[PDB]
Amino acid sequence: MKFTVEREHLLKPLQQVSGPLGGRPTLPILGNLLLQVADGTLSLTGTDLEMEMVARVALVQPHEPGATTVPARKFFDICRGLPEGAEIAVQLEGERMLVRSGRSRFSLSTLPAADFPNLDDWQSEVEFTLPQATMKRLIEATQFSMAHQDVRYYLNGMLFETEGEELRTVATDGHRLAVCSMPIGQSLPSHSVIVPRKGVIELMRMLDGGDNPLRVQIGSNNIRAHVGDFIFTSKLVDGRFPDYRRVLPKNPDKHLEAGCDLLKQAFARAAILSNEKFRGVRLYVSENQLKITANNPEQEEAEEILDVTYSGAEMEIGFNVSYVLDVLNALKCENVRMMLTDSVSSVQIEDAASQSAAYVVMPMRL
Amino acid sequence: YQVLARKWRPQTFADVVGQEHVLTALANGLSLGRIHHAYLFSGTRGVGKTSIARLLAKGLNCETGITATPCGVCDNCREIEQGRFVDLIEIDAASRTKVEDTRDLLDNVQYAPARGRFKVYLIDEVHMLSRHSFNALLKTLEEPPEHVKFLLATTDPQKLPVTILSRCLQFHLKALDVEQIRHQLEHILNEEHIAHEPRALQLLARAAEGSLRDALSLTDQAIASGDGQVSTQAVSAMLGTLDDDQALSLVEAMVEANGERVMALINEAAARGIEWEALLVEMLGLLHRIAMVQLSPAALGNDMAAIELRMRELARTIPPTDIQLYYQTLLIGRKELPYAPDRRMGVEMTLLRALAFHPR
Amino acid sequence: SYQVLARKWRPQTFADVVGQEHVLTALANGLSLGRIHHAYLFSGTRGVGKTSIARLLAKGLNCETGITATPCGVCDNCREIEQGRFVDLIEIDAASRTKVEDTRDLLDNVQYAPARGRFKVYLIDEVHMLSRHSFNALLKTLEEPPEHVKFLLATTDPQKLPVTILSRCLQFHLKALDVEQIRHQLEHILNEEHIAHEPRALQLLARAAEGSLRDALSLTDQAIASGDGQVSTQAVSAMLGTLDDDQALSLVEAMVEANGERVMALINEAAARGIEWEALLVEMLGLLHRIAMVQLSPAALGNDMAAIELRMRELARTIPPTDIQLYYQTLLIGRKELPYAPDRRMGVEMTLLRALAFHPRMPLPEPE
Amino acid sequence: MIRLYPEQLRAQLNEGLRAAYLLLGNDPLLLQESQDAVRQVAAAQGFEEHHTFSIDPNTDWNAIFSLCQAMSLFASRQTLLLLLPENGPNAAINEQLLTLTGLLHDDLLLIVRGNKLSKAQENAAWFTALANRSVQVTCQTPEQAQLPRWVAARAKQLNLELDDAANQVLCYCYEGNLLALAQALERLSLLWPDGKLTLPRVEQAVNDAAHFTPFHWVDALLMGKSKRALHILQQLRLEGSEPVILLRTLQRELLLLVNLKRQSAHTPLRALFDKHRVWQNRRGMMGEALNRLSQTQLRQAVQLLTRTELTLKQDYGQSVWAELEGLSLLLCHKPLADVFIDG
Amino acid sequence: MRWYPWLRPDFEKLVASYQAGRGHHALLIQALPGMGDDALIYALSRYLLCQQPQGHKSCGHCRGCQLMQAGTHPDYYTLAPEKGKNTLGVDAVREVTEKLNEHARLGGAKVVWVTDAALLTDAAANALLKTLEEPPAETWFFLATREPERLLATLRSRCRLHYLAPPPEQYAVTWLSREVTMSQDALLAALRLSAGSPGAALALFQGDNWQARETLCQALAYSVPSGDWYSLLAALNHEQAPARLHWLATLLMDALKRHHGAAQVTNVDVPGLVAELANHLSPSRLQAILGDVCHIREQLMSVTGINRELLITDLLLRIEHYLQPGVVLPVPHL
DNA sequence: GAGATAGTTACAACATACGATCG
DNA sequence: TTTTTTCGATCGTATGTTGTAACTATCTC
Numbered sequence A: 001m002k003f004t005v006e007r008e009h010l011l012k013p014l015q016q017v018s019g020p021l022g023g024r025p026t027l028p029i030l031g032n033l034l035l036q037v038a039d040g041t042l043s044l045t046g047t048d049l050e051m052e053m054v055a056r057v058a059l060v061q062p063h064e065p066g067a068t069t070v071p072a073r074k075f076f077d078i079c080r081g082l083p084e085g086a087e088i089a090v091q092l093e094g095e096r097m098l099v100r101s102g103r104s105r106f107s108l109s110t111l112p113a114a115d116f117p118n119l120d121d122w123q124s125e126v127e128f129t130l131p132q133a134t135m136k137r138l139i140e141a142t143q144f145s146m147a148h149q150d151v152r153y154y155l156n157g158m159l160f161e162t163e164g165e166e167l168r169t170v171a172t173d174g175h176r177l178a179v180c181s182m183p184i185g186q187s188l189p190s191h192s193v194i195v196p197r198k199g200v201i202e203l204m205r206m207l208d209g210g211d212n213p214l215r216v217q218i219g220s221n222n223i224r225a226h227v228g229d230f231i232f233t234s235k236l237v238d239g240r241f242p243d244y245r246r247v248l249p250k251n252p253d254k255h256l257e258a259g260c261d262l263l264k265q266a267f268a269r270a271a272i273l274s275n276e277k278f279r280g281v282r283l284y285v286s287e288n289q290l291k292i293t294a295n296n297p298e299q300e301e302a303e304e305i306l307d308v309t310y311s312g313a314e315m316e317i318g319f320n321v322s323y324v325l326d327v328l329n330a331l332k333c334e335n336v337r338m339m340l341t342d343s344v345s346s347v348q349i350e351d352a353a354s355q356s357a358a359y360v361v362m363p364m365r366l
Numbered sequence B: 001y002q003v004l005a006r007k008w009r010p011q012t013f014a015d016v017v018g019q020e021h022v023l024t025a026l027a028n029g030l031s032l033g034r035i036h037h038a039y040l041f042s043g044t045r046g047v048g049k050t051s052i053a054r055l056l057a058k059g060l061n062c063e064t065g066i067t068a069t070p071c072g073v074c075d076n077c078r079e080i081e082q083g084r085f086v087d088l089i090e091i092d093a094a095s096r097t098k099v100e101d102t103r104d105l106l107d108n109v110q111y112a113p114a115r116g117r118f119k120v121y122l123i124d125e126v127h128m129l130s131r132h133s134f135n136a137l138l139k140t141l142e143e144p145p146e147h148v149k150f151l152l153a154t155t156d157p158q159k160l161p162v163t164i165l166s167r168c169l170q171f172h173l174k175a176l177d178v179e180q181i182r183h184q185l186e187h188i189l190n191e192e193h194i195a196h197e198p199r200a201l202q203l204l205a206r207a208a209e210g211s212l213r214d215a216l217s218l219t220d221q222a223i224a225s226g227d228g229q230v231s232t233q234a235v236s237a238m239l240g241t242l243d244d245d246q247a248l249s250l251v252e253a254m255v256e257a258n259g260e261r262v263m264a265l266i267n268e269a270a271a272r273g274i275e276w277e278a279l280l281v282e283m284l285g286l287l288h289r290i291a292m293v294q295l296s297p298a299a300l301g302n303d304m305a306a307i308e309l310r311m312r313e314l315a316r317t318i319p320p321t322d323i324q325l326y327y328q329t330l331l332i333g334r335k336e337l338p339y340a341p342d343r344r345m346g347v348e349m350t351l352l353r354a355l356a357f358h359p360r
Numbered sequence C: 001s002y003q004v005l006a007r008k009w010r011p012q013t014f015a016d017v018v019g020q021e022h023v024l025t026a027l028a029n030g031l032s033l034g035r036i037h038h039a040y041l042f043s044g045t046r047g048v049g050k051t052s053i054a055r056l057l058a059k060g061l062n063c064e065t066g067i068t069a070t071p072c073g074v075c076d077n078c079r080e081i082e083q084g085r086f087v088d089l090i091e092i093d094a095a096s097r098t099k100v101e102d103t104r105d106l107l108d109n110v111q112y113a114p115a116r117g118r119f120k121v122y123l124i125d126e127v128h129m130l131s132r133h134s135f136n137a138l139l140k141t142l143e144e145p146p147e148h149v150k151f152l153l154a155t156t157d158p159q160k161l162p163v164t165i166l167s168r169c170l171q172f173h174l175k176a177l178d179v180e181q182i183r184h185q186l187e188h189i190l191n192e193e194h195i196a197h198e199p200r201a202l203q204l205l206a207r208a209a210e211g212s213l214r215d216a217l218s219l220t221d222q223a224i225a226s227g228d229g230q231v232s233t234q235a236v237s238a239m240l241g242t243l244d245d246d247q248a249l250s251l252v253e254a255m256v257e258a259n260g261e262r263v264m265a266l267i268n269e270a271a272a273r274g275i276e277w278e279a280l281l282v283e284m285l286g287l288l289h290r291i292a293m294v295q296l297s298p299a300a301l302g303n304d305m306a307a308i309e310l311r312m313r314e315l316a317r318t319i320p321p322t323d324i325q326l327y328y329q330t331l332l333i334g335r336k337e338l339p340y341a342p343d344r345r346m347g348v349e350m351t352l353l354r355a356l357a358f359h360p361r362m363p364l365p366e367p368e
Numbered sequence D: 001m002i003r004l005y006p007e008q009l010r011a012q013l014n015e016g017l018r019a020a021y022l023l024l025g026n027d028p029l030l031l032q033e034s035q036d037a038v039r040q041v042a043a044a045q046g047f048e049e050h051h052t053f054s055i056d057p058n059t060d061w062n063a064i065f066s067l068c069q070a071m072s073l074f075a076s077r078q079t080l081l082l083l084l085p086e087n088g089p090n091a092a093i094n095e096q097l098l099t100l101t102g103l104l105h106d107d108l109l110l111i112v113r114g115n116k117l118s119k120a121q122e123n124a125a126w127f128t129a130l131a132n133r134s135v136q137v138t139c140q141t142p143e144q145a146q147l148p149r150w151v152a153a154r155a156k157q158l159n160l161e162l163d164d165a166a167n168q169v170l171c172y173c174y175e176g177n178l179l180a181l182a183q184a185l186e187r188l189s190l191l192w193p194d195g196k197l198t199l200p201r202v203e204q205a206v207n208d209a210a211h212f213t214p215f216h217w218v219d220a221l222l223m224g225k226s227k228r229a230l231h232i233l234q235q236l237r238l239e240g241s242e243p244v245i246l247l248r249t250l251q252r253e254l255l256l257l258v259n260l261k262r263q264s265a266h267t268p269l270r271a272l273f274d275k276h277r278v279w280q281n282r283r284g285m286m287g288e289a290l291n292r293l294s295q296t297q298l299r300q301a302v303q304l305l306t307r308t309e310l311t312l313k314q315d316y317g318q319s320v321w322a323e324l325e326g327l328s329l330l331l332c333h334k335p336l337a338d339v340f341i342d343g
Numbered sequence E: 001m002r003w004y005p006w007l008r009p010d011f012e013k014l015v016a017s018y019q020a021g022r023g024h025h026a027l028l029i030q031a032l033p034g035m036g037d038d039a040l041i042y043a044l045s046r047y048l049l050c051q052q053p054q055g056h057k058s059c060g061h062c063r064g065c066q067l068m069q070a071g072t073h074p075d076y077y078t079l080a081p082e083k084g085k086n087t088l089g090v091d092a093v094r095e096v097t098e099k100l101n102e103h104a105r106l107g108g109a110k111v112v113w114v115t116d117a118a119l120l121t122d123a124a125a126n127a128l129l130k131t132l133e134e135p136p137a138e139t140w141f142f143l144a145t146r147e148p149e150r151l152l153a154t155l156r157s158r159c160r161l162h163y164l165a166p167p168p169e170q171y172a173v174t175w176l177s178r179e180v181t182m183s184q185d186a187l188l189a190a191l192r193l194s195a196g197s198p199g200a201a202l203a204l205f206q207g208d209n210w211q212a213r214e215t216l217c218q219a220l221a222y223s224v225p226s227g228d229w230y231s232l233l234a235a236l237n238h239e240q241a242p243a244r245l246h247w248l249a250t251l252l253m254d255a256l257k258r259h260h261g262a263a264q265v266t267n268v269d270v271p272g273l274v275a276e277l278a279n280h281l282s283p284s285r286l287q288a289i290l291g292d293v294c295h296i297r298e299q300l301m302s303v304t305g306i307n308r309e310l311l312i313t314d315l316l317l318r319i320e321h322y323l324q325p326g327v328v329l330p331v332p333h334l
Numbered sequence F: 001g002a003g004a005t006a007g008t009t010a011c012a013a014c015a016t017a018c019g020a021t022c023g
Numbered sequence G: 001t002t003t004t005t006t007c008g009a010t011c012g013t014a015t016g017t018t019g020t021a022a023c024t025a026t027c028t029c
C-alpha cells in the first residue's frame, strides 16, 4: 500500500477537512479522519456526526485498495514539520502505518476503519446541477434573513424548494421575509426541504468563484453537494415551514417607486441619530413626497425629505431602519418598488426591473 | 402509531371533558368582547391546561373572527393544529430559563403579527423560570401592546411570585371525577373498536386518581398486555387487585396480636406476589368501614355481605380509639413505604409496630 | 375591545388615589412649600399604587402651570405623561436594565438639559433587581445630582438594597388597603361602568383581594366574565366563595354536641352538593380559630361575618378553650393525613370519627 | 543558607551583603520592613535600578531573563524582586527558577518574597543550590503570648511610654494584625507628641480589627475562655468565613476527645497520646479539656454538630452561627438547658 | 451487562409490539438492581436500530449493527451521570433535546436511553417533560428505575410502565448453586438480603462484601453482650455504608421476628447472633434501633456530601444511650 | 490617472477565570 | 516538625485571543 504524496497537493485539502474538526473530540475516533484509496483516487473524509466533508485527490502511481483512520492533529503536525516541497511515502504495515520522510521513519497508530461513522449507500430523491454563480447569488440574497436562536426551531434555517424548473430560497425570522426564485432549466418534482444555519454557512464558505458547476442531491433525510473535488453532506431539520405566499400581502393598493441609491443614503443619514437599541424611524408618504423622521433617547431629532413617484393617500408608517438598509443593500439595484396597504400592514419591497426576488418587512406598532 | 393520549387531544370546546366553569367563562368573555391580556391556567396533572390554552389561541386567531367556537378548517386553525403557525410562539420555560432568552423575547413585542391579528405567547410550565425572568416579565405583562396576548399554564401556582399571579387572570381547573373518566374511556374505546368490560373501565377510572392522561396510559398498558382486549382479568393483574380475604385475615390477626399468623400470611402473600400498597389501601378501607359500622349499625354496605358477619364481630370488640390508632399506623406505614430498604421490609415493620400497639 | 379595568381606572390625580393619605399629604406639603428632594423611594406590597403615585408626582413637577400639588391634567405635558409620551420622563426597566453598562450610559447622559419640561425625571422601576455595580455607580450621582434632575425609585423588596442607597433617599412605605376602601372603590368603578352588582359579591371580592387593589380588579373582571355581564353573589361564590357556607358551622356544632348521626347526614348532603373536602376542612379550622380569638378578645369578630356573629359568640361562652384546641389540633392532623388517605371523603370521615371518639365530654361507647 | 529573623537583619546588612535574599512568611508588615531595609542598604551600596515582578505562569520569563542578561546603558548593580504565588511554586516555576539561578551574577541582586514554603516546596534543586550563598528570613506572626513583648519592643523603638494596660488593650484589639498595630502606634504618637500613652488615650483611639483562624477558635474552646471564643466566632463571621471549615475543624478534635475519654478508663493518658500522635505542646491542653468535662458532655455536642450540619445542608438555613455559639457555650462549663439540643 | 435467562419471556412481549408498529414512545421498566433490565433495554435498542432485522433478533451484519457493536452509532444517545458524580445534569438533557430536533443520519429510528431516572434532578425532569410528551417521529425513549413512586408525577403519568419480578426462590437458589459454590443457607440468606434478586447475590459473593458482612456479624456478636456499640464504627465507616446498615436492619428485624415467634427469617446462617439479640434486647428497643438505622440510611443516601463518620458516630452514641433505663424512645410521626 | 491586489485596523464573537445568591 | 470545605443551577464583570469585514496605500497597467 505505497502512497506517494506531494506537500503542495496535500496542503489545502488537509486544512479544508480539518476545518470542521475541533479541539473537543467527544469520541475516540471522531477526531481521526478516514483515508481510503479507490481505483486511482484517494479520499480523505472527516465528520462530527452532524456534517461530513470528503476531499478526493487523483493518484497516478500504482496502488491497491485500502482504508484506514489517522488522527488529524498528528498528521497535520507531521505535514507542517516537513520542509516545503518534500515527498511523503505512506505504507500500511500491520496496525501502525509507516511514514518515510527522507531517512526519517515514523510509526503512526491506526484504528480500524469499519468503526468510522461514514455513510455507505446514498439514495437521491432529487438531484440536479447548477453553476456556482446562481447558488452563490441565491445564498447571498437569502442568508441575512435567517433567525439565529429562536424557540421556533423550523425558523432557524433556509427553505429550499424545487418546483417545475424553478429553485426558490426562503428565509424568515418572524419579523422579515426574503424570497428568491431562479430558473434552472431542468424539470424537477415539487419538493421542499429545510437546511440549518451550519449547512448553509459551510456551503457558502466552501463555495468559491464560479469555475465548475456543483451538483446537489437531496434524499429523505440528507443533502449532499459535490463541487470540484469536495463533497459536503448535511442533515435536515424536518420541522415543516410556513408558506411564504401567505405572508406576502394580498392586493397592495399603494405603490411607490424610488431610486435605490437616494433611499439608501437618506436612510443611512437618518440612522445617525436613530435609537441605538431599537433603530426606529417614521416614514410619512404623501403625493410625490417621502419624509423620514428619526428620534433619539437623548431627545435628538433628524428629518429628511425626498421626492418619489407616489399618488395615493397620505400614510404614516413606523419601521426598523436596520432591516430596510439591509434589504436595500442586498437588493443592489437602481429602482426600488415598495408596495403597502395600510399603516398596520407588512410592506413588500421589489425591483422595478424584475421580480426575481422579493422582501417583506412588518412595521413596528407603537 | 400515536398513543391515545397524543391522538385524542381535544380540538374543540365540545370535546373537553368537564371544566365547565372555565369554558363558560372563556365563552362569555369572548362573546362580550372583554378579552384579557394574561391568562394563567392552574391545575393538577393532566387536566387539559395545554389543550384549553391551544383552543383559546385557535379561537383568538381564527379567520372568521374572534369566536368561542373555532371552525377548525380555516388555514389558521389547521396551521395551529399542525404547530407551524408563526404568530403562535410556544415557550418551554424549562429548556429556556436563562434571563437572556426572556429579555430577547421581550424585545420582539413591538412588531406587528406576521399573518394573524394577535401575537400569542403560550408559556407552558412557567413555574421553572428564575426570579430574574419573572421580574423582567412583570412590566410587559402589566401593560403589553394591543396586538399581544400572554397565556400561562402551570401545575404549581404557589411557586410563582405574588406579583405575577396578581397580573394575570387565574383559572383553577378541577380534577376529573371517576364517572367522567369512565365515560371518556368508553367513548374512546368505542371509537377505536376495542373490546372492553364495565369492571375493567371502572377499575381503570378508579386507579387514574383524577388524571385523564394516567387513565389513557393505563388503558394503553392493558391493550398492550391484554392482546388488544381490555378485560377485567388483565386490568386486575396489572393493578394487583386484591380479591380474596387476605386483607380481612391480616386485619383480624393484627387485632388478635397473633404475630405468628401475621408473618405466615405475609410470607404467603409474598410468595404469591401482591402489590403492597394495594394491600395497605384495602386494610385502611376495611378499618374505615369498621369505624363507620361502629358509628351506626347500618353503615355496612351490601357489597361486603360475604364477610359482613365477621366485620360486625370486630365492631363489637375493638374500641374506636384502637381502630383510629391502627388506621393512623397503617397510613404512616403507607407514607414511608417508598423510603424503605425494601417494600416487604416496610410492610413487616409497619405490621410489627401495629402488633406492639396493643393497649389491652 | 374593552380595555382592562386596572389599566383604564388608573388614578390621574391625587384625588383619585384610594388611601395612602400620609404619603399624599407629605408630597402635597413638599410641593406647596417648595422643599423638593432629589431622591424619592417608594416601597410596599403589590398593587398599592407606587407607580401611580410616581406618575402623579412626575405630572406635578412638570406642569406648564408651575410646580403645583394639584396638576391641571389638561396641559399638553400632563396629556403626554398620561399617554406615556412625555420626552422628559425617562422610565427605566431595572428588571431588564440590570447590567452596569446601562447605568453607566444613563449617568453619562444625565448632564444635558431637558427638552421642554423644567425637570428630567428618571423613574426607575423594580430597582431592587440592579446589581451592586449599578448601585455603586448611582451613589455619587444621587449624592450631588444636577439641579434639573430628579430620581424616583419604586420596589417591592427594599430590604436587599444597599444601606447607602437607602440613606441617600426619602423613603415612603405604602400600607395595604383595608377591606372597606377596596369595597368602596369596586362599587364606584362598577357604578361608573354601569354593571349590576350585589353587596355580598363586593364583600367577598374585597375579602379575597387581600390588600392588593389590582387583585380586586382582576377578581372583579373574572366575576363579570363568569356572570355574563353581571356581578352576582352566586357567580362570585362559584369561583371564589365555594367556601363560607352554613354547612361548616353546622358540622362544627354537631361535632361539639357529639351528634354522630347529624354529622353523617351533613357529610352526605355535602357530598351530594359536590363540596371540596379540603375546603371544608379549611373552613372548619377557620371557624374554630375565630371562636378561639373571640374567647381571647371579644372584638376579634368583625362585621365581615356578622350574619353568624351571635351563634359564634354562643360557641365562645360554652366550649372551654381546651376543647377548642383539641378540635383544632385533631383537624390539623387530619389535614396532614388527607393526601395519603385512600379517598378524600374517607379521610374526612375518619378525621371526624377520630374527633368524636376522643370527645372530651361524651366519648363513644366502649365495647363490653 | 544563613537563617535569620527580621530583628537581626540590620546588623547582617551592615556587616555585608549577599548574593541573594529570601523572605518567606505570613505577616505583611515584617516582610515589607525587611524588603525596605534590604533595598535601602543596596541603594546605599550603589544599587540604583529596581524591578519587581509577580511570579505567575501567565507572566513571561523571557523578559526577566533578558533583563538579567542585559546591561543597563548608564547603570549597574540592578535589583530584581520576585513575588511568589500564594499557593506556592509549581514544577514549571521550579524549572524557571533553576534556569534563573544560573543567570545570577554579582551585580544582580535577587529578592524573593512570598508565603512560607512547605516541606515539599522547600525541597527544590534551585533552593538547595542557592542555599550555599543565600540568606533566609523567618517571618512568623507572633502568638498571643509573644505579642506583648513585640508591642513593648515597638513602643521602645519609637520612644513611646506604653503602660501594661495599654499594651494589653492593643494586643486584644489588633490581635493577629501587626500592620494595624504599627499604624495605631503611629497615630497615637502623632496625637500626643509628649508620648505619654495612658490607658484612656489608647482606649479612645482604638478600633477592633483582630484577625483569627478556626484553629484559634478550637483552641479557645478547649481552654474554656467563653469570652475569647465568642469574640473569635464574631470576628470570623464578620470577615465572611464559611462555617463548613469551622465545623470540620471542630469535628476532628471532638471525635478525638470522645475516643480518648472512652478509652481513658483503661489506659494511661500518655500511652493514648503516644498512640494517637498528638503534638507535645497540645498534650496539656488536651488533658485539661478531658478532665474538665465528662461523658455527659461531648455526647450532646455530637448531636448539636449533626443537627447543625443537617440544617446547613438539607434545609440551607441561615441560623448556623447561633448554633455555633450555642455549641461553643456548651463546650464551656455552662448549663445549656438542652431544649435547643433537641435530644 | 449479562443476559439472564429469566429475561427471555418479557422481551418476547415487548419486541412484539414494536413489530406491529404499536410501541409506546416512552417505556419505564421497574426492576430491582441486578435484575438485568439494562440487558433488556440494550437488546430492544439493538433491534430498533438494526436495518435488516431477522425476526426478533438483530442481523449483526448491517451498518447499524456494526456501529452499535463499535459504540459509535450517530443516532444512539445515552444519558448517564458524569464520571465521579452521582447525578444527571440539565445540560445533558438540553443537549439531547436540541439534537433530537434534526433527522436521523442513517434514516432510521432514534433511541434515547436514561441509565437511571432516579438520578435526574428536578430541573432535568422538568426539561424532559415536554420532549417526552410530543417527541418527534421515530423517536423512542427508554427509562429504568427501582421505585417509580419517587419519580415526578408528571413524568410518571406519560410513560408505559413494565414491571419485572424475580423467579421463585427455588429457581434462584438453583441458579446460584450452578454459578457460585457455597452452603445452601448462605445462598438463601444472600438471596433474601437481595430482595429475591439473583444478580445482587452473585455480586455480594463476588468481592469482599461477604467478608465485610462476617466482620460486622463478629463485631455485633461481641458488642451485644456488653453495652459497647461504638466499636461497630470501624465495621460501618466505609463507602458501602448503606449496605451494611441494611444488613444490620435485617438482623434486627429477624431478631424481632424471633421474639414474636415467627418462622421465616431473613438471616438463615447466623442463628446464634439472632438468638442473642432477641435475648438481650426488648422489642421496643429493637424497633427504636431499627427505625434509627433506617432513617440514618435514608439520610446518607439522600443528602449530598453529608459526613459519614459523624452521622454513624452519632447513631451509635444514641443507640447506646437508648439502652439505658428510663429513656424515652422515639415515636414515628408524619 | 485609475483599478486591482495586498496589508492594516476595528468590531464582533468565543473562551477563561473569579465572585455572589438561592435552593 | 502542621493539620486542604456541601453541591447544583443561574447571573454578572472584566480581560485576552482569533477570525472576518471594511478601509487605505502602493504598484503596474
Ligand SMILES: Nc1ncnc2c1ncn2[C@@H]1O[C@H](COP(=O)(O)OP(=O)(O)O)[C@@H](O)[C@H]1O
Binding pocket: B004, B005, B006, B007, B008, B009, B010, B015, B016, B017, B018, B019, B044, B045, B046, B047, B048, B049, B050, B051, B052, B153, B212, B213
Ligand atoms: N379536561 C380534559 N378533557 C379532555 N382531555 C383531557 C383533559 N385533561 C387531560 N386530557 C388528555 O390529556 C392529553 C393532553 O394533556 P393535557 O392535560 O392537555 O396537559 P396538561 O397536563 O398541561 O393539562 C390529551 O390526550 C387529552 O385527551
Ligand SMILES: Nc1ncnc2c1ncn2[C@@H]1O[C@H](COP(=O)(O)OP(=O)(O)O)[C@@H](O)[C@H]1O
Binding pocket: C005, C006, C007, C008, C009, C010, C011, C016, C017, C018, C019, C020, C045, C046, C047, C048, C049, C050, C051, C052, C154, C213, C214
Ligand atoms: N391607591 C390606588 N387607588 C386607585 N387605584 C389603584 C391604587 N393603587 C393601585 N391601583 C390600581 O392598581 C393597578 C396597578 O397598580 P400599580 O401601578 O401596579 O401599583 P404598584 O406599582 O404598587 O404595583 C393600577 O392600574 C390602578 O388602577
Ligand code: ALF
Binding pocket: B044, B045, B046, B049, B050, B154, B155, B213, E154
Ligand atoms: F402537560 Al401537564 F401537567 F402533564 F401540564
Ligand code: ALF
Binding pocket: B163, C045, C046, C047, C048, C050, C051, C154, C155, C156
Ligand atoms: F408594579 Al408593582 F408592586 F409596583 F406590581
Ligand SMILES: [Mg+2]
Binding pocket: B049, B050, B051, B124
Ligand atoms: Mg400540558
Ligand SMILES: [Mg+2]
Binding pocket: C050, C051, C052, C125, C154
Ligand atoms: Mg408598579
Ligand SMILES: [Zn+2]
Binding pocket: B061, B062, B063, B064, B070, B071, B072, B073, B074, B075, B076, B077
Ligand atoms: Zn378557523
Ligand SMILES: [Zn+2]
Binding pocket: C062, C063, C064, C065, C071, C072, C073, C074, C075, C076, C077, C078
Ligand atoms: Zn398640566
Ligand SMILES: [Zn+2]
Binding pocket: E050, E051, E052, E053, E058, E059, E060, E061, E062, E063, E064, E065
Ligand atoms: Zn443489523
